[PDB]
Amino acid sequence: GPSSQNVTEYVVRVPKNTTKKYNIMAFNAADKVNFATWNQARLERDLSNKPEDQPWLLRVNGKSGRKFKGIKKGGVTENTSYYIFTQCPDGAFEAFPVHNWYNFTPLARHRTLTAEEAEEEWERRNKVLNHFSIMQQR
């Protein structure tokens, strides 16, 4: 076959209103995230900036089960609007406007290298020879 034989026609509507703003949530394919592993998620605007402009903070599978930061794209409707097209039970198509583009990226967990206690100084002395031991001394 149908990908090489089927011929269909469906109606398209563009409603002048919606009950919710529509945004894009983009992931790097290279990560190949299993969405099934997402039992739950939390989603909040990022707190570094202390609203609509705020980057998103996504917490999946608990506070530290999975966490990503989403950064807004420069533009989304600067030349061409983006639409979400959805199939309805009547076969007709429904189109939804894209309000914004946020870029989501993965985020390492606990590790913490302060690089301020003496590491800024230690670099001045650095001969490229050691790096691990400071991480234990903390």
Partner: protein, 244 residues
Amino acid sequence: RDGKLAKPRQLHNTLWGMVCPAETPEGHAVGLVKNLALMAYISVGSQPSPILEFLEEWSMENLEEISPAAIADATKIFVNGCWVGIHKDPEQLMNTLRKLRRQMDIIVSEVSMIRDIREREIRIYTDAGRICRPLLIVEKQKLLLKKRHIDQLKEREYNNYSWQDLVASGVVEYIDTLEEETVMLAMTPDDLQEKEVAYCSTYTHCEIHPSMILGVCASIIPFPDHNQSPRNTYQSAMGKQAMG
């Protein structure tokens, strides 16, 4: 001023048709002082953005909309140093932009458009201060102009047929040095159109007349080439020294 020693003055070859070589003071400021060519012109500066929007429509990929690695094959296009995008088929784009350029829908007097296969790049500049000059447009190793158009130029003495219309005619275009690097310039319409000894026939444009290189002063003295070259510079200075 900035950047000194081991730089001096002599001459650059691209200056051909851009500045008269003889038109300089015989003082220490020699070569340090330059003079405008007979038919050279300067860019006033424009905004590529409206043109840039059609480009997005012509199908030019945005920087944040694609991953550079995902589009290794496409030619990168540059405008005012700014990387506007890439196009998988630059040649039609170059041809289309030029035909728009030839259609006068693109300002030949301002818009420069250059492509380097070696770099796999297309650079465009519409900033002020760029030097350009008009050239004859050679097509199929032949001139694009018609003798009837001359009659139109004759009609202009009474009625009208503006030089701008000749510009609008697109049989001639206005040309910067960046464009010159890529064009195959012709010395003369007559001899170069000959095939009998056509070492090349890939000519793209031709000079209106070699005298157009000359400045106000050099233009005064006849057959400067039968004369020693500095004498003309001395004349160019001394002409300025004359009473009248």
